[PDB]
Design a protein around this nucleic acid. Structure first.
Ligand SMILES: [Mg+2]
Lengths: 59, 456, 463, 52
DNA sequence: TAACAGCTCTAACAGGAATA
RNA sequence: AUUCCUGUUAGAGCUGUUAAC
């Protein structure tokens, strides 16, 4: 399942809301999900942020 | 040791309406935005015909007339919204039937009412409606009325009057919305009006609402069974149902028999693989031929060892099969504490053990109530004081309670025949049960698959 | 230590460069080798199925390991290689590989000093296992002490070695592969992760609007009981009618198993039919009552007998389900006062046993159905509040009344009812409660069960 | 299926939008059996030329 | 194949209307 | 049968454990 699908986005957001996480595009969400996924591991966080914003997809 | 795995509260699923304006509460969304198919104008005007004894004909007119007038709820006012009439709420005119379409029940039916012969009464009713076989284009929905005087043949051992009538009329391809004295009797007028209006609109061909952001690549199968009390032994009638969403905008809901004789409700290797192959072909026909990337199966009883392999052998590797058994009778029941003034939230699922979870399909829902805004609503507060959690037993899914739990929770909201907020079971289970009753009453239906709009 | 899920996350974030030191698992390892991820894999056993799976996946042979062939392949960056330790020609190769990228070792408990010194020598260098060393075992506590010693030594040296607990190596690799991205169609067709027949999805952490269930945990993992030996075969129906006609002060079943006093056994069974009396120690109560239904009924009846042994409440039966029904004579006890408060309407005293308003002789009382639930490997005592009617076969005549009384027993009222009934049945509130009950304490074969007083509950997981 | 006779009235009125809407609305009988068929052969009589 | 235990479901009736 | 599924009364099917045929 992809990520830009509407159905999968709604299902994932409903799952996130099931565990009491912030609702929708609200403050303290981006940092919240980063600190949730990477559980305070700034090296792994840096590596992921490098991979997502790497210098191969940029045109 | 008194600590259990952390429960997760699945949010209340949203329903899709006209102009894709989502809402959790179905009837309120229907009032505010209208039916989902209103943008497509699929039903257009709704044209309906009558078939009842003349001595009660006026009653039908009355209810139909009162379908075209606003009604304010008096019972369950905490949930039901003010009715605005068919013309306003559904954005569709309600057509007064002409005398040519209007039919009268043939007199001998009354006579056979004394004889207590259900089959004869059903056949006589079909012959009464036979005057409407040629004029199928003129009307969309037939309104058969069965008077209370026929109650002797309404229900008796081995026979169901409505079941037999619909089983006889479905192969002729004309929907009926049978109306008895109950619909007239029933105090709260808005409740019945919502029920009949939604039922008629959906039977015409429209879609009152659809699951919001529903995945079109997942098909949710549901198998159920019914009892026929044979003289020598028992007979188990097993039928399947599908609620998938095609590549279009509308969504499908079709049931079919699983078939020669069965004494146990467990499908063998051959029968289960056959019904699943038929389901796969049905799904392929709608989506140009694409495989279903994930299949849900809801059975009322546990899957056998051979049955699981039969389900597997019918699909390719890409398909993900999550066999699920739904159990309604459990010793468990939940109490919500923060002691909450309202029962445990609907959708709160509790993973008990590996491949065993507790889903609270029944429960309080936030923001749905109309009176006293901002308060939870318990739909079944009249019957039970506290909700009864159903139990899922997983048999095949690789992982994830969220997928099955959210799928089932959303599926318990698209029963158009139901005029309340939700059900106890997914629509797959309830429609498979209804078609199981239909097939058990009438053995000559096993060949063809039928849409939900016929038997709903 | 670290949870398997975070280990999976770290492996998936950087899997292009991570070792593998060592069926579905072997086949998917070959698939990962084909996909150019996890270039270098080391192994100890023969396990010639890795290269066969790779050939099936791709259609070309696999380099299997000359003097320094592994060194030549690694230095020239001509991945992938599959070198077997067979435990110095690999010593230098392992050292260079440890310099290059991190290692995950599965299916190995250590116990070999050669590879132990190999890895310890690989650790010392300035940048050894930069991504991390991951010793994965099916169970953390079952691992050999040398593995934990090496993990602690590496952590002290500054390396990021970890010991994570996962499942079987093949299951671990399947869970890893189900989340690897951008895989060719042919490979997925080849592997497809086979099929998962025995579904087992992990229960989440306890976490922290909680729900309070009615289940009371049973922590008595084993009980002692008696066995009687018969010179002739018996059927369960014959035993049941013998108990009905005699009514001894003991609990009987066939599997012949008993619990109570020996003189009651001598009463129920004559000397001629009795051979000897011995003892049975059912080590795993949960598994036993799950496998055999006779044990299930016997154990639930034993707990029931132990629960109302010293209490004034009466014990009844309805469709083979036991009920703790309040007797009319002892309905005025102070212990029921809390229940008097719970049934009470709008904060008043509430009747708990009386006469139904519109029937001649039916008398109603409050009661709880007590059942045994074997869930997973745990025993739960299941409490369900209910209204009992004195005539068993006339209950339906009070149906309307049953609907009338419970019509407004909502969440707060039902919570009060359940708490009051727990207090009545056990004498203590659900705070630090592991009270003990015993059935037939004055008998050779007695059963003592310790039931957690607090009902099972769980808090919703949140941030 | 059979097209509504109101389609003829709309065609005589020369209203293309309403004619297309009526043709689509005539499809409900088939939509109750959408699984049954694969391709629908919609025919238009020459008398509707004024709205073609 | 005949009992026994439990789990679970349907078959027929009856039945009131959503925090009082 | 506009609906909802709460009870009651029963039976069946699955598993098991014995006795065998
Ligand atoms: Mg209906």
């Amino acid at each position: 399942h992809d990520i830009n699908n509407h159905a999968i986005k709604s299902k994932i957001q409903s799952y996130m809301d099931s565990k009491g996480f912030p609702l929708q595009w609200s403050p303290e969400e981006y940092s919240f999900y980063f600190e949730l996924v990477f559980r305070d591991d700034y090296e792994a966080q840096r590596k992921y942020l490098l991979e997502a914003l790497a210098s191969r997809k940029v045109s | 040791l008194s600590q259990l795995a952390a429960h997760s509260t699945i949010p209340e699923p949203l329903l899709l309406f006209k102009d894709n304006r989502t809402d959790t509460h179905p009837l309120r969304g229907l009032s505010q935005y209208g039916p989902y198919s209103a943008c497509f104008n699929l039903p257009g005007q709704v044209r309906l015909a009558y078939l009842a004894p003349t001595e009660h004909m006026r009653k039908l007119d009355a209810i139909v007339r009162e379908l075209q007038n606003p009604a304010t709820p008096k019972e369950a006012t905490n949930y039901y919204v003010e009715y605005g009439g068919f013309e306003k709420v559904f954005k569709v005119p309600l057509v007064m039937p002409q005398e040519h379409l209007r039919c009268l029940a043939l007199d001998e039916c009354h006579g056979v009412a004394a004889n207590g012969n259900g089959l004869a009464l059903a056949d006589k009713i079909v012959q009464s409606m036979s005057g409407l076989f040629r004029q199928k284009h003129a009307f969309d929905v037939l309104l058969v009325y069965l008077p209370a005087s026929w109650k002797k043949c309404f229900e008796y051992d081995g026979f169901d009057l409505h079941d037999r009538i619909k089983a006889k009329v479905a192969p002729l391809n004309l929907p009926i919305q049978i109306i008895n004295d109950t619909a007239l009797t029933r105090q709260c007028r808005a409740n019945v009006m919502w029920g009949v209006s939604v039922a008629l609109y959906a039977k015409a061909g429209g879609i009152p609402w659809k699951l919001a952001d529903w995945d079109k690549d997942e098909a949710y199968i549901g198998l159920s069974y019914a009892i026929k009390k044979n003289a020598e032994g028992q007979e188990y009638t097993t039928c399947c149902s599908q609620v998938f969403d095609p590549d279009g905008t509308g969504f499908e809901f079709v049931a079919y028999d699983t078939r020669d004789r069965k004494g146990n409700p467990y499908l063998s290797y051959q029968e289960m693989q056959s019904v699943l192959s038929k389901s796969l072909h049905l799904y392929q026909s709608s989506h140009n031929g694409r495989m279903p990337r994930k299949i849900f199966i809801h059975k009322t009883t546990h899957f056998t060892e051979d049955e699981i392999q039969g389900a597997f052998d019918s699909f390719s590797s890409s398909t993900e099969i999550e066999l699920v058994q739904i159990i309604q009778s459990t010793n468990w029941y939940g109490l919500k504490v923060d002691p909450a003034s309202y029962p445990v939230d609907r959708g709160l699922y509790q993973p008990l053990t590996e491949s065993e979870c507790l889903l609270w399909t029944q429960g309080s829902v936030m923001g749905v109530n109309q009176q006293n805004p901002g308060q939870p609503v318990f739909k079944e507060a009249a019957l039970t004081p506290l909700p009864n959690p159903i139990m899922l037993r997983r048999f095949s899914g690789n992982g994830g309670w969220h997928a099955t739990c959210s799928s089932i929770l959303a599926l318990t909201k698209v029963d158009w025949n139901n005029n309340t907020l939700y059900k106890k079971l997914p629509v797959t289970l309830v429609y498979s049960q209804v078609f199981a009753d239909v097939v058990k009453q009438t053995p000559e239906i096993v060949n063809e698959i039928y849409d939900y709009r016929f038997f709903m | 230590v670290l949870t398997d899920n975070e280990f999976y996350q770290h492996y998936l974030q950087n899997s292009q460069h991570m070792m593998w030191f060592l069926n579905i698992g072997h086949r998917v390892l070959a698939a990962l080798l084909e996909m150019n991820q996890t270039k270098v894999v080391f192994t100890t056993n023969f396990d010639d199925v890795i290269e066969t799976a790779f050939s099936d996946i791709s259609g070309k042979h696999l380099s299997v390991y000359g003097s320094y062939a592994a060194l030549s392949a690694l230095n020239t960056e001509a991945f992938p290689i599959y070198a077997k330790i067979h435990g110095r020609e690999i010593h230098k190769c392992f050292l260079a590989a440890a310099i290059r990228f991190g290692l995950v070792v599965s299916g190995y408990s250590g116990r070999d000093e050669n590879v132990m010194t190999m890895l310890r020598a690989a650790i010392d260098q300035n940048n050894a296992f930069p991504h991390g060393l991951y010793w994965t075992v099916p169970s953390i506590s079952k691992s050999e002490p040398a593995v934990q010693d090496l993990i602690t030594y590496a952590q002290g040296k500054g390396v990021r070695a970890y010991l994570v607990e996962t499942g079987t190596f093949d299951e671990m690799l399947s869970k890893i592969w189900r989340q690897v991205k951008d895989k060719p169609a042919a490979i997925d067709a080849k592997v497809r992760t086979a099929r998962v027949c025995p579904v087992s999805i992990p229960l989440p952490g306890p976490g922290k609007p909680a729900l309070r269930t009615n289940a009371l945990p049973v922590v008595t993992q084993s009980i002692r009981c008696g066995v009687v030996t018969l010179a002739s075969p018996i059927t369960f129906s014959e035993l049941k009618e013998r108990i009905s006609q005699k009514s001894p002060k003991a609990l009987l079943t066939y599997t012949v198993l008993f619990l109570g006093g020996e003189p009651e056994i001598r009463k129920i069974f004559s000397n001629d039919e009795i051979n000897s009396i011995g003892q049975y120690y059912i080590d795993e109560i949960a598994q036993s009552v799950a496998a055999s239904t006779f044990l299930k009924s016997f154990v639930e009846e034993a707990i029931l007998t132990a629960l109302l042994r010293e209490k004034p409440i009466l014990h009844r039966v309805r469709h083979r389900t036991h009920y703790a029904v309040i007797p009319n004579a002892s309905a005025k006890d102070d212990r029921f006062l809390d229940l008097r408060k719970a049934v009470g309407f709008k904060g008043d005293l509430g009747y708990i046993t009386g006469n139904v308003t519109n029937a001649k002789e039916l008398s109603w009382a409050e009661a709880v159905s007590i059942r045994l639930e074997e869930r997973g490997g745990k025993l739960w005592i299941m409490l369900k509040p209910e209204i009992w009617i004195k005539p068993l076969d006339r209950r339906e005549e009070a149906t309307d009344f049953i609907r009338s009384r419970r019509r407004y027993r909502f969440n707060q009222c039902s919570y009060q009812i359940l708490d009051a009934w727990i207090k009545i049945l056990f004498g203590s509130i659900g705070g630090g409660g592991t009270v003990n009950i015993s059935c037939f304490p004055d008998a050779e074969f007695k059963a003592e069960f310790e039931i957690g007083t607090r009902t099972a509950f769980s808090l919703g997981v949140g941030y």
